[PDB]
Design a protein around this ligand. Structure first.
Ligand SMILES: Nc1ccn([C@@H]2O[C@H](COP(=O)(O)OP(=O)(O)OP(=O)(O)O)[C@@H](O)[C@@H]2O)c(=O)n1
Ligand SMILES: Nc1ccn([C@@H]2O[C@H](COP(=O)(O)OP(=O)(O)OP(=O)(O)O)[C@@H](O)[C@@H]2O)c(=O)n1
Ligand SMILES: [Mg+2]
Ligand SMILES: [Mg+2]
Ligand SMILES: [Mg+2]
Ligand SMILES: [Zn+2]
Ligand SMILES: [Zn+2]
Lengths: 73, 186, 928, 188
RNA sequence: AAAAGGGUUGUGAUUUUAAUAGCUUCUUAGGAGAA
RNA sequence: UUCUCCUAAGAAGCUAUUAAAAUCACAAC
């Protein structure tokens, strides 16, 4: 059930970004919202995965906001 | 509601009345037994109702305190739960591009911008060490997010422009790592 | 050659090179629209004429142009009669040139009447093409638009070129016609001025006038003493009226010399009353319209005259500058300090209205006066800054703060445990029939202003006066069975007092605070105050955080406390009676459980013959709604009050409703804007007014469908008589014919049965009559919505069903199925499974994610799940069992948690009944 | 409660009945004493029940009075807040120009919409894109509402200050649109 | 975090109160029986 | 006069149902 997992992960990822005070930057928040809604509306999996890649790049760019090595372990 | 203090008297009075009616004893004795049964049963029901009230109050108290404590527990820890759930689902997805970017970020090779979706768009990446450069880069090409890119410019920590030829294992100590790389999508 | 000789005589003394259209001397065949009232037919309909020969004129380069010669062949007495009338009328410049000549057709002598330089199409053709919009009529509308340089032929290759919503540019295309329409109006008045002076009695109809404004067809007229002639113009103006606003003719009035090339008039900025200019416009354009017109509706005698004068006012107001249409302010003194306060309103609809209880000097402010002065926007707008907002086309008044506010919408929370349980059970696999479709969509900071800018769709609209005045009585027939009236403050019921009180009252508390602070005497004093004075109020816009299938934002309007209190006290007695009734057309307040759905469906099916079901949707319903229909709904609701309220009190109540709900000041992001019109979300009457508007639209569609049919082809004599009497009642009668209103109401209820709830409707209709054209269908709804609402109803959204055993395709988002229960068969509703699964998976608060507390939350979701078990699709059936098993698991986990924490088990086990099916089955059995 | 005198009479009857039962008196004496004791019991129960009724009535009346006092306090607080807001707004507005325009009016009435246009000293403009900025606000002074305005510094969507030198066609993608410009009214 | 959170109808669960209903208690009068 | 039995009124206690208030949650236009 890959596509439903991708959509649920998009919901969780945008919630994580929102809690991280991304809203303070209106431009970045608008881009994140567009990516989230586009993934939710998408119908075929590869487009959703590429948009997910961009949305996750948003979170990864924020150096020191999340301890990636601690979280993933 | 059982084994209450008045229960024994009620039970014994009913048994005595039943034995009396089974014997066919004197009517006045039967009526005396029945009235004693009735008064004992009245007391039994009264204390049973009191016990019911106590039980209801205890049940409500326990339920309310459970609700409040668990609501506080759920509300306090939201951020860590969200991050842990996100990364658990990300591992469960098992996608090559997501794993590639996540593992690169774990090694310190984070991007400086949103990774673009379209051809010839611009991406910027940080390179912590020559080993990660050896892994990620090959001549004029860069491999990132399962996609192929073309190197545009390499810079240093003091903003010095560095030529691609300079990056070598023997020459590496001269550079002030980390490096910044700019690339376009093929 | 005979044909060449006939053409040479037709040419006459003119220098017009003629082109022999048709064939020789033969009569030509054309399909054209006519307005007609005979002793045997009465209609506004398309006909095949076959009455005259036609020739075309060619330019000096021998290419064809829009200028025709038409010659009619008819009886000799008509020949002399028309010659006499035309000889009378010759002096007028609004009359087309006529010639009369005799010619050898059969070898004998035949008379002919010729008219010159006519356009291809008449005014009736344009009016019919716009009012009865469909693709077949689109083929004529395209030719009309192309011929008069509105647009080039390639324009029609665009997608949705006709759509007011997807292609707003179409509104620019129609405006080019408008000036050509205006010249038609003036000519008509000129013609009347001749006809009265000559001493002629005749009726005017649209078909006689060409698109240049010239007239013909004198045969109907009769003579009278000079200076005492009369024109009859009711049907002409009444049919023309919607086109006047659609094409925006009076825009030419805006300029100084009324030349479209001259600059605009620069009015005095402080001017607010235009009574003389309204009277001048009415006298110029509508000279011979024989009914008294009041520029200010306060003078009007009754609700019908209010509708009439407001219908004229809405057309006339477009000319005047936008800044004047607002509340009027005045300076007063209190305890020696100066206040600025409101004293009156200038309505685009209802004119200039003044308050009666003003105080120029006062010593103290009571609580009621403090509420009144804090509520109205005069102080906030006067103290605030000046605003110029380029994000919206709407007019903007002021900014209340140095900073504008951008409001976002957050995403929803994920209920991972239920998702994992569902995936373990086997849902959400690729290729499954059930999948996630409803989500919590996020929004950026621009959401609120964009959803406000959606209001731009609302446009001014002038309705067909006579048709509307008949339709309003037909609707009052639908509503008449209820009771209503005013009540004292102690009687009113409020559902929830922890709701917002609007702006600025929300700064200090919820509605409970104001309901506690004011005794019943203060509330009754305020309500009595509104019956004599207009109170403007501010409305706030909020963004709603809720699950949806579509990603566009949704905003809702909160209304100030004063308007809510007075509107509740006014309307609640009628609204509660509407909710209490069963078996009516308006189905508000009827539950779907315990057999209600079967009863509603059986009620709608009653006594129709050859039945079909159909339903439709209004696009952009609340934004697009014309002001006139909202006024009509308010007046229909006010009609119940006649027993207890005098006319002045009811007019002031209507003015209050207009000032607060219809065109109030809207607060968004800290800035004040003016709402152009349409429905608001917090009226305290919104659903019932929407139901009134829905019924009015359906009745108008039925009226158009019956009138458009060719009366010669109807076989049933009863329906022909009904059509004749319908035309008579609409256009050729003045006072209301109650008997025919009852007769038409009975006809509608017999053949066309409705079920109504806000903008959702189902109708069961007679398919044979619908195919013959005696009752409405989807096409008529499309045309009526196109010309009245200024929206195009996408036919794909509508639906129709032929088999009554399957029920309606959609009502209140429910699907219908037929099932066995005992030895009886019943109807049951079931929802979209995606909605139930999404409501399980996504929640709007973090605490809801924990299941044990939410056990009671899941039980309700199981109830809607119960009908899905009856479905023949297994994937649908599995959902209800999934919910039951999740409830069982939640109870087990709760027991374990409490046993671990407190070390004592629970002593009450009612929850055992929840995971077993029978309880849910009780919900739908009609037994109790 | 035991202090009730009816309870005391019942207690004397109770002592009499207990002594009679302990002594073993005849059934007829026990019956008469029982009916006396039950009369006393009926009196005691009746008085206790009416006492319960009186006490609960008193509690309800007291709760009503407490609720009324709280309502009066809330009313006073709301009145104070409303008066303060109204007088602050009275002090904020510019009396001179508003008095001039109101004195100019024919009847003393003026439309509300014209008051901010004529009297207001400060203007705010919200601009979504660079083309609109170039059209509406190019330069340090611009004319609107038949008046001349001079500019005060600008803020973006993040409410951070933007210098007027930054706003340019090439740089436009970097800014966080929309932009909010503020201005003051020139004296002339 | 701040801020803000509309109108109308239906449904479920929990607590409180009122009114009918059934039963127990024991006081009072009348009728009947026995001496 | 005294005992037993029945009927009727009052005062308490338990229980079944119906109807009104408050709190939480769900669904629709
Ligand atoms: N611009 C144009 C072009 C063509 N025509 C044609 O002229 C004829 C008009 O006939 P008429 O003698 O004026 O009227 P009538 O048929 O006696 O009247 P009725 O009983 O009201 O239908 C029709 O064939 C077309 O409508 C036109 O009028 N105007
Ligand atoms: N909280 C809510 C929610 C809804 N509504 C009502 O639902 C309706 C929503 O309109 P709709 O026909 O569903 O949608 P629309 O805007 O016409 O969209 P379109 O069909 O794409 O043109 C309105 O009558 C009210 O907005 C209300 O009252 N409160
Ligand atoms: Mg005609
Ligand atoms: Mg709709
Ligand atoms: Mg529908
Ligand atoms: Zn009037
Ligand atoms: Zn009334």
């Amino acid at each position: 059930s890959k596509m439903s997992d991708v959509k649920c992960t998009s919901v969780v990822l945008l919630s994580v970004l929102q809690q991280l005070r991304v809203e303070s930057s209106s431009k970045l928040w608008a881009q994140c919202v567009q990516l989230h809604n586009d993934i939710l509306l998408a119908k075929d999996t590869t487009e959703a995965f590429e948009k997910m890649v961009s949305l996750l790049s948003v979170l990864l760019s924020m150096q020191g906001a999340v301890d990636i090595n601690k979280l993933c372990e | 509601f059982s084994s209450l203090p008045s229960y024994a008297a009620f039970a014994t009075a009913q048994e005595a009345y039943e034995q009396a009616v089974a014997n066919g004893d004197s009517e006045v004795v039967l009526k005396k037994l029945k009235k004693s049964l009735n008064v004992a049963k009245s007391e039994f029901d009264r204390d049973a109702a009191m016990q019911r009230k106590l039980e209801k109050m205890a049940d409500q108290a326990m339920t309310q305190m459970y609700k409040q404590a668990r609501s506080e527990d759920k509300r306090a820890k939201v951020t860590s739960a969200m991050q842990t759930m996100l990364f658990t689902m990300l591992r469960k997805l098992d996608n090559d591009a997501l794993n590639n970017i996540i593992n690169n970020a774990r090694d310190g090779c984070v991007p400086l911008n949103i990774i673009p979706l379209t051809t010839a768009a611009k991406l910027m990446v940080v390179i912590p060490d020559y080993n990660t450069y050896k892994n990620t880069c090959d001549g004029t090409t860069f491999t990132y997010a399962s996609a192929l890119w073309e190197i545009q410019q390499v810079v240093d920590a003091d903003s010095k422009i560095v030529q691609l030829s300079e990056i070598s294992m023997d020459n590496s100590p001269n550079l002030a790592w980390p490096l910044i790389v700019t690339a376009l999508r093929a | 050659a005979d044909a060449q000789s006939f053409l040479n005589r037709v040419c006459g003394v003119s220098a017009a090179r003629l082109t022999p259209c048709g064939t020789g001397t033969s009569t030509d065949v054309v399909y054209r629209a006519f307005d007609i009232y005979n002793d045997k037919v009465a209609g506004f309909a398309k006909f095949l004429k076959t009455n005259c020969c036609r020739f075309q004129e060619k330019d000096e380069d021998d290419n064809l142009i829009d200028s025709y010669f038409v010659v009619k062949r008819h009886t000799f007495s008509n020949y002399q009669h028309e010659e006499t009338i035309y000889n009378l009328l010759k002096d007028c410049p609004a009359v087309a040139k006529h010639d009369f000549f005799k010619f050898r057709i059969d070898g004998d002598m035949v008379p002919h009447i010729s008219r010159q330089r006519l356009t291809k199409y008449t005014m009736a053709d344009l009016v019919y093409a716009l009012r009865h919009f469909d693709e077949g009529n689109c083929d004529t509308l395209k030719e009309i638009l192309v011929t008069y340089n509105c647009c080039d032929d390639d324009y029609f290759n665009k997608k949705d070129w006709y759509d007011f919503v997807e292609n707003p540019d179409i509104l620019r295309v129609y405006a080019n016609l408008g000036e050509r329409v205006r010249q038609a109006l003036l000519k008509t008045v000129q013609f009347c001025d001749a006809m009265r002076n000559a001493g002629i009695v005749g009726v005017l109809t649209l078909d006689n006038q060409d698109l240049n404004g010239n007239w013909y067809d004198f045969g109907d007229f009769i003579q009278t003493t000079p200076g005492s002639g009369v024109p009859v113009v009711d049907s002409y103006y009444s049919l023309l009226m919607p086109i006047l606003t659609l094409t925006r003719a009076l825009t030419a009035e805006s300029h100084v010399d009324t030349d479209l090339t001259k600059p605009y008039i620069k009015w005095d900025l402080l001017k607010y009353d235009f009574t003389e200019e309204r009277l001048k416009l009415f006298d110029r354009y509508f000279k011979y319209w024989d009914q008294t017109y009041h520029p200010n509706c306060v003078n009007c005698l009754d609700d019908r005259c209010i509708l009439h004068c407001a219908n004229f006012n809405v057309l006339f107001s477009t000319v005047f500058p936008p800044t004047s249409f607002g509340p009027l302010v005045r300076k007063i003194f209190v305890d020696g300090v100066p206040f600025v306060v409101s004293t009156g309103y200038h309505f685009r609809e209802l004119g200039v209205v003044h308050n009666q209880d003003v105080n120029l000097h006062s010593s103290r402010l009571s609580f009621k006066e403090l509420l009144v002065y804090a509520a109205d926007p005069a102080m906030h707008a006067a103290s605030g800054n000046l605003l110029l907002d380029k994000r919206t086309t709407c007019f903007s008044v002021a900014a209340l703060t140095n900073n504008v506010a951008f409001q976002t919408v957050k995403p929803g929370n994920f209920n991972k445990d239920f998702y994992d349980f569902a995936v373990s059970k086997g849902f959400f696999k690729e290729g499954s029939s059930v999948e996630l479709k409803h989500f919590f969509f996020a929004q950026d900071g621009n959401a609120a202003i964009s959803d406000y800018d959606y209001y731009r769709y609302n446009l001014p609209t002038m309705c067909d006066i006579r048709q509307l005045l008949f339709v309003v009585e037909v609707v009052d027939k639908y509503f008449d069975c209820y009771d209503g009236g005013c009540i004292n403050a102690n009687q009113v019921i409020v559902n929830n007092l922890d709701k917002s009180a609007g702006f600025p009252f929300n700064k200090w508390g919820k509605a409970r605070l104001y309901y506690d602070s004011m005794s019943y005497e203060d509330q009754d004093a305020l309500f009595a105050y509104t019956k004599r004075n207009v109170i403007p109020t501010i409305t706030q816009m909020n963004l709603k955080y809720a699950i949806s299938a579509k990603n566009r934002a949704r905003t809702v309007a909160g209304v100030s406390i004063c308007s809510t209190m007075t509107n509740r006290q006014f309307h609640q007695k009628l609204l509660k009676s509407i909710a209490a009734t069963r078996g009516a057309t308006v189905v508000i307040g009827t539950s779907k459980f315990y057999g209600g759905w079967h009863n509603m469906l059986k009620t709608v099916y009653s006594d129709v013959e050859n039945p079909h079901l159909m339903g439709w949707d209004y696009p952009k319903c609340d934004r697009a709604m014309p002001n006139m229909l909202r006024i009509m709904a308010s007046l229909v609701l006010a009609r119940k009050h006649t027993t207890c309220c005098s006319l002045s009190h009811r007019f002031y109540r209507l003015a209050n409703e207009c000032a607060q709900v219809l065109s109030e000041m809207v607060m968004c992001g800290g800035s004040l804007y003016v709402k152009p019109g349409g429905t608001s979300s917090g009226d305290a009457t919104t659903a019932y007014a929407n139901s009134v508007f829905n019924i009015c639209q359906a009745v108008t569609a039925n009226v158009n469908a019956l009138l458009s049919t060719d009366g010669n082809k109807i076989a049933d004599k009863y329906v022909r008589n009904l059509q004749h009497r319908l035309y008579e009642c609409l256009y050729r009668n003045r006072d209301v014919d109650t008997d025919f209103v009852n007769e038409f109401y009975a006809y509608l209820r017999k053949h066309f049965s409705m079920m109504i709830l806000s903008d959702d409707a189902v109708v069961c209709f007679n398919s044979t009559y619908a195919s013959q054209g005696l009752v409405a269908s989807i096409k008529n709804f499309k045309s009526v919505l196109y010309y009245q609402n200024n929206v195009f109803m996408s036919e794909a959204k509508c639906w129709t069903e032929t088999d009554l055993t399957k029920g309606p395709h959609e009502f209140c988002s429910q699907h219908t199925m037929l099932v066995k229960q005992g030895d009886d068969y019943v109807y049951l509703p079931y929802p979209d499974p995606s909605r139930i699964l999404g409501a399980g998976c996504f929640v709007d608060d973090i605490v809801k994610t924990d299941g044990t507390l939410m056990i009671e939350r899941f039980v309700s979701l199981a109830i809607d799940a119960y009908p899905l078990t009856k479905h023949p699709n297994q994937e649908y059936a599995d959902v209800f069992h999934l919910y039951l098993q999740y409830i069982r698991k939640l109870h087990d986990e709760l027991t374990g948690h409490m046993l671990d924490m407190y070390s004592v088990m629970l002593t009450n086990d009612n929850t055992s009944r929840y995971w077993e099916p029978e309880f849910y089955e009780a919900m739908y059995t009609p037994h109790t």
